[PDB]
């Protein structure tokens, strides 16, 4: 003799020892990224090609 | 006679029960099961 069993309810596991099907469908995906940058240029110049006489002292 | 018509007794009350079932034996006046899946499932 087994216990009371419902009629219209689905067959769910209810006690220790009942079986149940697992459908393994796992799909995980993670990601990350980053960056950084910096820059600097400089260029100076000056040239007195032909100096007049009254400025030759400087 | 009269007091029983005016009062109730503490601890003497009613409760409600609900359930799901199927009714068979209809003359073709049942569900159109193509739109009530729980009928065929149960």
UniProtKB/Swiss-Prot annotation, chain A:
Coiled coil: none annotated. It is found in: Cell outer membrane; Bacterial flagellum basal body. It comes from the Bacteria. Transmembrane segments: none annotated. The basal body constitutes a major portion of the flagellar organelle and consists of four rings (L,P,S, and M) mounted on a central rod. Assembles around the rod to form the L-ring and probably protects the motor/basal body from shearing forces during rotation. Belongs to the FlgH family. This is Flagellar L-ring protein. It comes from Salmonella typhimurium (strain LT2 / SGSC1412 / ATCC 700720). The lineage of its organism: Bacteria, Pseudomonadati, Pseudomonadota, Gammaproteobacteria, Enterobacterales.
Swiss-Prot record, chain B:
It is found in: Periplasm; Bacterial flagellum basal body. The basal body constitutes a major portion of the flagellar organelle and consists of four rings (L,P,S, and M) mounted on a central rod. Belongs to the FlgI family. Assembles around the rod to form the L-ring and probably protects the motor/basal body from shearing forces during rotation. This is Flagellar P-ring protein.
């Amino acid at each position: 003799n087994y216990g009371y069993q419902p009629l219209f309810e689905d067959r769910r596991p209810r006690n220790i020892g009942d079986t149940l099907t697992i459908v393994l469908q796992e799909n995980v995906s993670a990601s990350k990224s980053s960056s950084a940058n910096a820059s600097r240029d400089g260029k100076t110049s000056f040239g007195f090609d032909t100096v007049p006489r009254y400025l030759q002292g400087l | 006679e009269r007091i029983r018509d005016l009062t109730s007794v503490q601890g003497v009350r009613e409760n409600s029960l609900i359930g799901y079932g199927l009714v068979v034996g209809l003359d073709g006046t049942g569900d159109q099961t193509t739109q009530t899946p729980f009928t065929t499932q149960t």
